[PDB]
């Protein structure tokens, strides 16, 4: 009695666009076109689709099927499957905290760009400002200009010295203090996600209507804008120019495998939370199929959106779009792409809809990222929670604000890259590998096929079976071993990270991981009997 069964989605289209909003993010815009044009050019589509079909789709569909069938959170679902792995739900909660620290500061930059785009004359055009050096050299100035190693563009000057104020920090050692403008920008983001979350999936699905759809409009506007630009074919040429010798590199498949995983983000429990609220009779197979294609096709058309403007930017300069595409990261969108759209007519229009799109791309993914953890703890601690959902939502939101206070500093941009590379990447793959192995092996793939047979009415095909049994865990095992074997040496804004940054990153990487093996130690020490008896009861799920 009382509450009993959980809630359900309002409409089939709401959660369909909600999972699409979580998948489509900033990475689908800048990241995919860079790794595509760098590795093999247009030939990168061949391994990218293979890593999607074999690796990416089965994990995405397995994670989604477990959500709609069990209707449990990222924690409670392990109580009814493999209780020793219940720490997986806790690790995701620690992972999403590390994710939400930097992720909303990036949108705070795009929000600071959005609010600074309301002036008739955009600040990064002219070099006359409070934050510019004597190295600042803009256009609409004297011709014949020759660039200098020490010289800096007004857009690079604007992003370096103002929104980041990264010149005021020497590195990871001293990043202090905090920039309060980004603290207010991220506070508004934490407020707009507060009112888009606190109620539940009902408000998130409705706010997703705006946050998921608008990027495609802004992408289409910048697509038609970028296409009409003179000399935009150079970027598209360098974008789609096939290099088949790059396919012989053993690394490009790893880049394709890692790209498709982190773009779809399976096994993170967010897709598990979104599916928990759907209908039992409802079909999740057609959903996961088309949803992943949208994420890939959006990144494909986003490739033209970026490189058409990058091609025109290389047209006013001298060619080799690779050189203007040299630095990959926020500088591509916030400096190169922003300086490129500043030279176009009605630049206020395209600049507003650009950074708004960036906020629009990060809002939906941030809704679900918290939604997965909120659903996890609410389902894990029922009736000790749910007294008010705005209470637990406010607690996790303001916690991400204090966690972002380290990211809101002057050297906060240094911490963004430290957490994005070292921290989240390896542990999410590990927790998804342990998840995929536990579902396909411990719980068994036969009983999993029987649950789908009771769900949709038919057993899944042998293609998905061999993928879940072998191909999908091997897909995650491939990216793991490659990351651990070659830990990246990272550099940002003419500043090389210290040698010990990987040590600090491994601390942030293992700090989320320490829970599950200590929980397995907590489960095995509490369970009486012998090792074979207690583990069998620990391997056997809840009997009722």
């Amino acid at each position, epitope marked *: 009695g009382s509450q009993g069964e959980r809630e359900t989605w309002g409409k089939k289209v709401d959660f369909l666009l909600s999972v699409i909003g979580y998948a489509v993010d900033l990475g689908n815009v800048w990241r995919f076109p860079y790794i595509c044009y760098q590795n093999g050019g247009g030939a990168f589509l061949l391994p990218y689709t293979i890593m999607a079909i074999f690796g990416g789709i089965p994990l995405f569909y397995m994670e989604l099927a477990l959500g709609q069938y069990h209707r449990n959170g990222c924690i409670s679902i392990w109580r009814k499957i493999c209780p020793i792995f219940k720490g997986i739900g806790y690790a995701i909660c620690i992972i999403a905290f590390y994710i939400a620290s930097y992720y909303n500061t990036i949108m705070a930059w795009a929000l600071y760009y959005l609010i600074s785009s309301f002036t008739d004359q955009l600040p990064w055009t002219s070099c006359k400002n409070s934050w510019n050096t004597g190295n600042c050299t803009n256009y609409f100035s004297e011709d014949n200009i020759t660039w200098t*190693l020490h010289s800096t563009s007004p857009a690079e000057e604007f992003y370096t010295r103002h929104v980041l104020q990264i010149h005021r920090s020497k590195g990871l050692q001293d990043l202090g203090g905090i920039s309060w403008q980004l603290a207010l920008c991220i506070m508004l983001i934490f407020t707009v996600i507060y009112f888009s979350i606190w109620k539940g999936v009902k408000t998130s699905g409705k706010v997703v209507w705006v946050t998921a759809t608008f990027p495609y409009i802004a992408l289409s506007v910048l697509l038609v804008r970028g296409a009409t630009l003179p000399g935009a074919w150079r970027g598209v040429l360098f974008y789609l120019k096939p290099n088949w010798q790059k396919l012989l590199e053993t690394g490009v498949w790893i880049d394709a495998a890692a790209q498709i995983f982190f773009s779809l983000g399976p096994g993170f429990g967010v897709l598990l939370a979104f599916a928990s609220y759907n209908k039992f009779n409802n079909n999740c197979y057609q959903d996961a199929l088309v949803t992943s294609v949208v994420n890939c096709m959006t990144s494909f058309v986003s490739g033209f959106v970026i490189f058409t403007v990058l091609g025109y930017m290389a047209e006013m300069r001298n060619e080799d779009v*690779s050189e203007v595409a040299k630095d990959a990261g926020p500088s591509l969108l916030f400096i190169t792409y922003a300086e490129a759209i500043a030279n176009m007519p009605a630049s206020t229009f395209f600049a507003i809809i650009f950074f708004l799109m960036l906020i629009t791309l990060g809002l939906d993914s941030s809704f679900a990222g918290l939604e997965g953890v909120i659903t996890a703890v609410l389902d894990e601690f029922p009736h000790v929670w749910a007294k008010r959902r705005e209470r637990f939502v406010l607690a996790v939101v303001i916690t991400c604000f204090f966690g972002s206070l380290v990211t809101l500093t002057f050297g906060g941009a240094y911490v963004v890259k430290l957490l994005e590379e070292y921290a989240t990447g390896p542990a999410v793959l590990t927790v998804a590998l342990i998840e995929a192995v536990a579902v396909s092996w411990f719980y068994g793939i036969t009983q999993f096929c029987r649950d789908v047979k009771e769900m949709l009415g038919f057993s899944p095909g042998w293609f998905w079976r061999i993928c879940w049994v072998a191909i999908s865990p091997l897909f995650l095992l491939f990216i793991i071993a490659s990351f651990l074997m070659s830990p990246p040496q990272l550099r940002l804004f003419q500043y090389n990270y210290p040698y010990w940054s990987i040590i600090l990153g491994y601390a942030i990487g293992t700090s989320s991981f320490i829970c599950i093996p200590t929980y397995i130690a907590y489960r095995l020490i509490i369970t009486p009997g012998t090792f074979k008896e207690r583990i069998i009861k620990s391997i056997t799920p809840e009997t009722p």
Partner: antibody
Amino acid sequence: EVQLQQSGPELVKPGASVKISCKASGYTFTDYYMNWVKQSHGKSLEWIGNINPNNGGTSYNQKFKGKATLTVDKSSTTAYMELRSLTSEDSAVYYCTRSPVRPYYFDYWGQGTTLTVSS
Amino acid sequence: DIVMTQSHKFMSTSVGDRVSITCKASQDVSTAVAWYQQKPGQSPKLLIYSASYRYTGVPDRFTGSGSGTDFTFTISSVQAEDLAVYYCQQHYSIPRTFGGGTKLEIKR
């Protein structure tokens, strides 16, 4: 004004190593890339690679990768180029030339260094 | 990579005649081209950059033109001290390459 003074000619045996100094003056040394151009007898000019004086960042050529090593010193404002595994093809005139980051052109060249690899 | 091709290794002209040396690149350069003058026994001297523009210290008799793969280096008045070997070079893509060179022989 701007002068790039290289080292003198060198006669070395094959299989050995050789180093060529470049002395720059007349401008701000940290404001420009430093490049090295190889010219074979009767052949065209060949770009070996550049170097950034500030951090020593070296952008080489795929043809010269591992064949040449570019170094720089900001104290005396001097750039060097080292070559190992010397053959008869390596006998040629080498030039160190100044270039900006954009547009990329060689405005000032060194007087040249005559290299002869023989026993 | 990029291949700069000068089809004429030698071009015969006279003092005062209008001479034009061509250049052929691999792909479209827009306008980025540098014309150098290397006198025998001297280092290569820069003359033209961005294919229409002259470097400082270059007399008015040296011009350049063209936007595309093909470019033209034009000398209206040839002198006796103008005897040298001219090269064309592209600056966009790494690595930077040079043409085979065209030796200008003066007819008298």
